Amino acid sequence: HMNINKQSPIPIYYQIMEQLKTQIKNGELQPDMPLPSEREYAEQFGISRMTVRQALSNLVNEGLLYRLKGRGTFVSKPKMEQALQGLTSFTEDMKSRGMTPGSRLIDYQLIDSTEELAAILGCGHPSSIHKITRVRLANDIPMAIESSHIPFELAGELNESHFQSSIYDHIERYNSIPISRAKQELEPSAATTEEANILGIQKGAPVLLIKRTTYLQNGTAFEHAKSVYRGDRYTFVHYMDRL
Amino acid sequence: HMNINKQSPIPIYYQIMEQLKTQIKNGELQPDMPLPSEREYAEQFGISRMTVRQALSNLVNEGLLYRLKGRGTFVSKPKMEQALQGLTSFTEDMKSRGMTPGSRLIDYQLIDSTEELAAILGCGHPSSIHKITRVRLANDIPMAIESSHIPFELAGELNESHFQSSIYDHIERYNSIPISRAKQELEPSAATTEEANILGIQKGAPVLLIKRTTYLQNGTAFEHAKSVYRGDRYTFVHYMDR
Ligand SMILES: N[C@@H]1[C@@H](O)[C@H](O)[C@@H](COP(=O)(O)O)O[C@@H]1O
Numbered sequence: 001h002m003n004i005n006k007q008s009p010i011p012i013y014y015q016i017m018e019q020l021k022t023q024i025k026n027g028e029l030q031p032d033m034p035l036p037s038e039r040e041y042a043e044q045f046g047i048s049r050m051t052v053r054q055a056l057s058n059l060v061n062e063g064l065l066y067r068l069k070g071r072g073t074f075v076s077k078p079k080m081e082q083a084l085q086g087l088t089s090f091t092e093d094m095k096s097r098g099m100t101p102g103s104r105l106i107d108y109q110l111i112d113s114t115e116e117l118a119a120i121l122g123c124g125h126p127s128s129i130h131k132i133t134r135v136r137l138a139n140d141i142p143m144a145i146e147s148s149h150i151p152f153e154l155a156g157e158l159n160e161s162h163f164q165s166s167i168y169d170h171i172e173r174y175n176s177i178p179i180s181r182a183k184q185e186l187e188p189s190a191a192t193t194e195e196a197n198i199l200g201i202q203k204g205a206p207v208l209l210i211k212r213t214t215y216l217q218n219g220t221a222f223e224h225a226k227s228v229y230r231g232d233r234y235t236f237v238h239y240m241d242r243l
Numbered sequence: 244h245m246n247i248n249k250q251s252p253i254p255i256y257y258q259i260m261e262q263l264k265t266q267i268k269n270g271e272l273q274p275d276m277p278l279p280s281e282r283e284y285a286e287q288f289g290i291s292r293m294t295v296r297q298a299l300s301n302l303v304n305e306g307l308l309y310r311l312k313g314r315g316t317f318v319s320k321p322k323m324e325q326a327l328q329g330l331t332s333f334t335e336d337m338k339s340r341g342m343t344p345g346s347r348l349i350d351y352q353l354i355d356s357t358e359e360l361a362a363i364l365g366c367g368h369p370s371s372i373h374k375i376t377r378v379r380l381a382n383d384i385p386m387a388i389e390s391s392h393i394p395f396e397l398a399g400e401l402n403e404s405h406f407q408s409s410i411y412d413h414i415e416r417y418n419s420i421p422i423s424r425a426k427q428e429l430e431p432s433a434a435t436t437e438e439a440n441i442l443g444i445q446k447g448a449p450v451l452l453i454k455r456t457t458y459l460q461n462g463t464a465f466e467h468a469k470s471v472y473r474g475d476r477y478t479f480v481h482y483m484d485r
């Protein structure tokens with residue numbers, strides 16, 4: 001199934017870890033069928049069982065796999081439940097679940113309003129708009145890519161210390177008005193080459209494409225954001241009623 | 244670029260229609276850009292413009308393309324906005340959009356409860372559970388595949404006429420109580436070969452996978468459902484507050 005090249009300078013255990021990772025990334029491994037045994041892998045490739053064991057144990061310690069006594073070794077399927085109706089920040093979302101939020105700046109641009117953005121935000125035109133594009137990390141694992149358009153006057157000058165923490169925190173502080181309401185539009189999608197590369201997932205893997213338009217308590221729109229969320233680590237939850 | 248085969252029994256305009264359809268299907272030509280002109284198509288394939296015009300006009304009449312004056316012909320992107328917070332039936336969703344809801348039965352089985360299903364539904368074990376798997380149609384265009392699990396006692400015996408109609412309407416009538424509340428779980432997915440073939444979309448095309456547990460006004464769960472919705476024809480909407 002996988003491919004081991006003994007002539008390569010990459011150690012065999014490392015090859016196994018990487019190829020199993022690539023297999024989980026590619027969907028090639030069912031999540032609750034057991035992995036091939038140490039024996040099966042070792043015989044298949046003509047390598048030591050201890051080499052196989054080294055790889056599998058490392059993967060367990062990285063949480064990508066888990067052992068069930070008497071049943072074998074299984075692919076981990078960690079998925080966070082994300083509530084759709086509570087208006088929150090990524091930073092709030094992560095801290096609530098005891099994980100450390102982070103960000104890496106993909107791109108920052110101050111841009112001229114378009115008439116389309118101006119219609120969405122109800123902001124001036126012509127005006128200047130922050131365009132803040134970040135990958136959002138949970139314990140240094142990329143979870144999403146978000147591109148947030150915010151009218152300049154609702155945020156003022158921004159620097160790397162804003163980008164590396166919570167934009168919503170800054171928005172409330174800077175405007176002295178809390179964040180109160182949003183509208184979101186959800187669409188399933190396949191990760192583009194670039195999205196996959198930044199997210200560490202396979203090209204074309206399932207992502208949820210989300211557009212959010214977010215409002216201050218005085219009813220001013222301060223954000224129009226377009227984001228892609230990793231399908232493989234998220235479950236989006238909401239409720240419904242007749243009203 | 245398309246592949247026109249003039250030795251084929253299939254008429255050229257029909258090829259153009261089908262290959263354009265396939266191209267839209269496979270997301271191969273941008274929805275914001277205008278198609279190549281009548282002339283460009285004709286000159287590329289060494290065919291008559293009138294053949295091209297026949298194919299494009301047909302596709303306009305089918306609503307797959309549209310003509311913007313002076314700018315060109317464009318790929319239509321019919322989106323239907325689906326509100327996530329309002330508990331409704333497919334039948335209700337369509338009617339309120341002035342469209343005709345239909346269903347095609349994929350499979351019906353009356354099945355034994357499992358400890359897993361009984362936990363979800365709070366139903367009896369062992370008991371019988373309806374398992375109703377249908378294609379849901381909007382004016383004869385497939386929109387979703389749904390597999391609904393419903394405890395026998397909350398629905399009684401069902402036949403093909405129930406399947407072709409609204410299950411939710413039956414449920415409220417049978418139980419003399421309104422359908423009141425639900426929890427849904429959402430995740431994006433790629434359409435399986437089977438899901439794609441039934442939905443008329445490309446293998447691997449984006450779909451929304453949705454699990455619904457649905458409750459009657461008295462707190463009784465009556466449905467556990469697993470569905471896939473075509474990503475291309477839906478926009479799911481909800482609101483948020485603090
Ligand atoms: N999907 C939203 C984004 O639309 C928003 O821009 C972000 C701000 O998060 P933070 O305040 O941590 O910068 O929160 C969520 O993730």
Ligand SMILES: N[C@@H]1[C@@H](O)[C@H](O)[C@@H](COP(=O)(O)O)O[C@@H]1O
Pocket residue numbers: 331332333334335379389391408409410411412455466468470
């Ligand atoms: N997603 C829901 C399904 O979970 C539900 O089973 C169906 C019933 O629709 P109907 O009453 O038309 O049969 O409505 C929607 O489509």
